[model samples]
Target chain A: RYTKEDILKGEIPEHIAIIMDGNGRWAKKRSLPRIAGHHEGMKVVKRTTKLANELGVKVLTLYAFKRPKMEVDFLMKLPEEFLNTYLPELVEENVQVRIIGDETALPAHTLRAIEKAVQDTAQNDGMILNFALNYGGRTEIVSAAKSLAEKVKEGSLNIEDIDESLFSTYLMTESLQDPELLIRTSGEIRLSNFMLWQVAYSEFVFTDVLWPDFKEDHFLQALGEFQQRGRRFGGI
Target chain B: RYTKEDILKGEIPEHIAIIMDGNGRWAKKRSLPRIAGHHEGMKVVKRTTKLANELGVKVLTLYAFKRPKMEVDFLMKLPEEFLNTYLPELVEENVQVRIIGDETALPAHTLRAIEKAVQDTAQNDGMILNFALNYGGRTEIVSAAKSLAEKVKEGSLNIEDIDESLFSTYLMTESLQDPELLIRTSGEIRLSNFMLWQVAYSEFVFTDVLWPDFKEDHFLQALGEFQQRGRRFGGI
Candidate 1:
């Protein structure tokens, strides 16, 4: 159902960021256990990371967890197992793992595992994979502003010298280029507070494939749409 | 040669920042001479401004002039005439004028007239019409950074406290919302260093209509395209 030519044409993103949504709902729709969906979704995550690396994307940011979201503690215990099972494997594959956003609010075990995975993969050269754990766009902007303000107050900086590019260096994705393409699975239409400040000119591709069913083929379809766009960034 | 519905659709922008390119070209294309095209383009500018104001857009920034551009010298004398001709009318039509970018680089007469126009139209509660004269986005950003660095050097600020929003306050567009739609006419596809910091999420609209031909119909057409876009900011 997929072709290599199509993938090559859409041109894989230099920085492709995804919101890995719909895992639990996908399972509920099929009358299966929700944990099963998480497991399946994680498999796709692993697969997508591998393919994204193979396709030459430098950075891949995943909307894995949001700050202050609803989750029954009963269901929370299961994610730790998945982390223990897959994180070490990701590290061994030489994938650089980073957990962004406010992790202070996350489960202790999950946070521990995420921090460890990031540390282990810090040396990886294959691909930089970012997991946005407890992130919100407004909060990110506020945090960036707060820090900039502090620098201004501390007498190390002048108020006149700050601008956009220097300002972006304070963002979580400050380590990488702005996302060139932003893809959302499950046909979603909103930004959901992801990298708001960074994606100034990103081509967007939305698809209806549920997170659990997301595969290289579905990914390629989204990429195809991105490649077809004529990005006229305020010009001809 | 236009209809209301065609104005309603065809092309739309969420924030349409125009480079106002090619008055000289429009003149040459018609063998009408350059100043004639500039004068004709001014008519379209008024028409587009009125229409855009009626549409209730929050901000409309235009590249009215550049620092080193308009080398004809005779052309430099036209700013006051243009403002006096258009400014009071814009205010009478309930539009507010905002002069952005660097004014120090402009000729004294041009700057004074522009300041008077901005002051006179300051009370209008209609659409915001921002004119960028002697402005470059890169230059603006660099200038902003220089100001902020001065604070640091003065020991009133620190390097760690710099963030995006606070930095924006120092930008030329600190007072305006990030443009949601950016538009350019005459088949040009470059930003030409316009509003670099403020158009991060703007929908871009491009057309071949020369500046002299860009009217309310063109503006509304750009707005129609804006209504159909599905923006996804990297999250699900």
Candidate 2:
């Protein structure tokens, strides 16, 4: 039998990535409004963030938003509108919040609150929490290329110096190291374009649990699965 | 019920990539020398090349030699010490064989055989087979960077003109269309540093069938899997 002391004798990952999915479907299944699902999802996010920090993780990147917003017009604006209301509460945790993606493309009010959240936590030396908003892998690659292009044009860097290491630094979610473990909910076998470039060597663990139901126990299970993997980054 | 005709319909991929694995293990299972497995594997290679051409596939890239000598030694000086014995048969089939790897590191006999094969198949109008020998992903990236460096030094390409598309052309398997379907035999789950930069969107189909035992039906199964997949290349 494995003892608690035996369990403690292993390595822990510094960075963890999660593809939080199926909030609307979970809420709809419970006969609740979809926006209510978003509100509830925020609580799970807070709880997961707190747990990850306690586990001694240096960075956590949550797939907070996809490029294709689930809802548009007034309904789509509800999440950000809610964030404005909850901004002070999140700031109270002293969590370093960084909104990743094209912030310029977001609504003015959403951008203002998102900026305030980032600015408020700028000096926080604790765990870095990255929220991927309005992010798509294709868009991230394009943006990274554009930034690299600008750097080359300014004569600060050479065109030949643009390799994977340098190119990754220009990506939208570059502040955090590449995810050591990538966990996706809802039994999706495919990567679904979440951190495609960074998570190349990351161990993939799939779960049938829907995002709204994914709790700290599920998080611990995912970490346990990750601990069972042997990472060989193109070595013998 | 889907007909065979329906399965073959649509834009069939022009190129296919394969990782031929389990030569040693396959031979060991049969209580045979590893060389015997290599000889049998070459037969499968011939059959696969013919099938790929019949399928109207223009390009076929295979992870043929880990290191030409090591591969030959393990396979018992397989089929006339690698390419020498295989070239005539390939030339007869009008297959243009191009070895893409570190040729300088190869044995002289192996190098000559490969060079002869390339020369003989240079004018062939049938399917082109690319062999990866002593090839590593990191090495490929460095080589690509070197080419770009040369171009920039010559003033042919300015720093502003370099981009992802431009950078890709300098890779080992340059301009060979990205393999939409990547097949690996003997149940290998990992990419093994093969086509790292190129196969960003490839649909991987792994097989338990050993390389020596693999035939047309096995290849067809991979194609079948490809047909079932709805590859969304960064778009929904």
Candidate 3:
């Protein structure tokens, strides 16, 4: 019953965020190193972004990086590798590449590659492929708060004028809408510090399939479930 | 496998936040007015709190109210009614009643009843029954940010010192730890502006049972599921 045609008949969520999890476990299951799973997960990200764009999703935010990496070289080199392979196709697909995180801490070469991809896709407006790299949800809110506080301290903004919308303007996600649906792979039920402020009313879909194993079929299944949910924003 | 004894053997989440939803839908299913569902839901809240306390849960935060109530008279009177009926038993059970919202806008009688319950249970050191009355997650964060900004403006705090821990000190939930597990009753799979900042790494359990119909058994089932899940905080 959850065919493409049937899903298209219902309301499509504008922003779909994903917490791509279980990469290490997937690798461990196959007696491979964890970095192997990360590599495989990158492929899933590409396919998911393509399918989300094709489904007319306005924004797709992927939770890409978390935890301190032991393989620093491999971690820093990933953006260059991903963008080198997919940036041209992403540009051609009319998908804007946006990064939401503190880029200053990243390696210079990695930052350059990400900046190049973002610059190349600046004109594309069909769908936003937002990558939350080196991001922590609490850190984002703290930075937003500090920035807004600086404005208030400078006497440019009134303390009483600080509200929800005003606060959102100071966040890293200033240009984007809050996510409508959040999907987490590998049966994990936690948010894992992704989009704390943005997903205030997001319908969550948790699947047992590992990130490396996640496919277009799994993405469609999540969307189908999302369409069936009753989204009441704290009211009947 | 999910026996209550087995669940008790595992780690019980110290803080459990709940989004009590589907009361209106439950009432509709029974061909009763919406308030009837709310009334029944209150009983579940009492039982759930007792069960949670018995199960060694520390904090039980309930999303009771949000937004300005269109049914002004009934809405304002709910706290008075619920407190008047449950206060004695709650005091006996050592359940401290705490309200986390702007009490200024609440009706005089409603505020008085809530305050009286809070004052009455001030010495109780048992499980905290935190009611998010008239609360919005974004509003909470905005308030926290404004408070922090005021400190920054006063030069009492350095803008650089406004980190996650410092920001949390400004929130209404300063004393409470972030919830480890969030349970949403009814089939709805959204946060609905409840505990957005606090549930950054929270395991979510969404049940089909409506708020009115949520009993101890359903609560145990959710707890069991929570115990079964592995909660890695964004690490490998």
What proportion of true contacts does candidate 1 retain? Answer: 0.11
Residue pairs with backbone overlap in model 3: none
Task: Supply DockQ values for each candidate.
Answer: 0.14, 0.18, 0.64
For each of the candidates, what fraction of the native contacts does it recover? 0.11, 0.02, 0.92
- Give one digit per residue, the lDDT tens place, for model 2 in B1-236: 34345546745678899999887778788999766777788788888888787778899998853446565565434524557656777777788989787878676766776787788789998889988878776567556655555565566777667666776677787757878777877654555557666666666677778888888777776777777666433122
The iRMS of model 2 comes to 5.9
Candidate with best TM-score:
3
User: Which segments of candidate 3 are over 4 A away from where they belong?
Assistant: A65-70, A230-235, B1-3, B65-71, B230-236
Best prediction by lDDT: 3
How accurately is candidate 1 docked according to DockQ?
0.14
**Poorest 10 consecutive residues of model 1 chain A by lDDT?**
A65-74
Which runs in model 2 stand beyond 4 Å of their true positions? Answer: A1-11, A19-51, A54-56, A64-95, A99-102, A133-176, A184-197, A206-225, A231-236, B1-12, B24-43, B64-82, B185-188, B207-213, B231-236
Model 1 stretches with alpha carbons more than 4 Å out: A5-13, A19-41, A64-82, A148-168, A184-193, A201-214, A221-236, B1-44, B56-84, B105-109, B132-236
Error of 2 at B200 (Å): 2.8
DockQ, cand. 2: 0.18
Across residues A187-231, which tens digit of lDDT does each residue of candidate 3 receive?
777788888888887888888888898887778788888876644
- Cα displacement (angstroms), candidate 2, residue B54, comes to 3.0
Model 3 interface CAPRI class: medium
